[PDB]
């Protein structure tokens, strides 16, 4: 699984893009995360978003990484 670290660093990168639309996969190969704002929370200011309740996350599986 994508680690908590990975997920949070991705959230830090795309904070200003974060919306109710699912983000791209955070990785181009291997397993990563997609994130979005829970639609019922579209109204909240972005610095009021609760990590567990307003940020939805799911694993996205891409092609294997080269070695």
């Amino acid at each position, epitope marked *: 699984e994508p680690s908590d670290k990975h997920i949070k660093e991705y*959230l830090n990168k795309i904070q200003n893009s974060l919306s109710t639309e699912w983000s791209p996969c955070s990785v181009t190969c291997g397993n990563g995360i997609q994130v979005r704002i829970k639609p019922g929370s579209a109204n909240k200011p972005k610095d009021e978003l*609760d990590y567990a309740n307003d940020i939805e996350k799911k694993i996205c599986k891409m092609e294997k990484c080269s070695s």
Partner: nanobody
Amino acid sequence: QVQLQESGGGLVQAGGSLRLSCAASGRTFSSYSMGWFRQVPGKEREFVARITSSGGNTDYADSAKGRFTISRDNAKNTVYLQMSTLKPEDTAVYYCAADLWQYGRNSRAADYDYWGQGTQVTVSS
């Protein structure tokens, strides 16, 4: 990774005030959102306050709103918890925690990444 060490806990009379400190190793302190939790026997840590890495915005549990103030000094690599109007029910071990998510709100112990050793606050009536 960073290492956290809390201090400032002790014995305080009810109605009193107390300031706890939590210092971090390394030079990446400022990239972490910092939280304070507290723990009583038989129960898991409960959220007290949070201060984000990006913009120093703050958030408070219901038990702490109006009474407590969380602040940080990144030059000193320290986050602070200023508590006032202390009651016996506030007796607990107080923990600081670091969270790599730099924005927003976060009140679950499971969703923080690094933990201090805790400092005991005893409030007598």
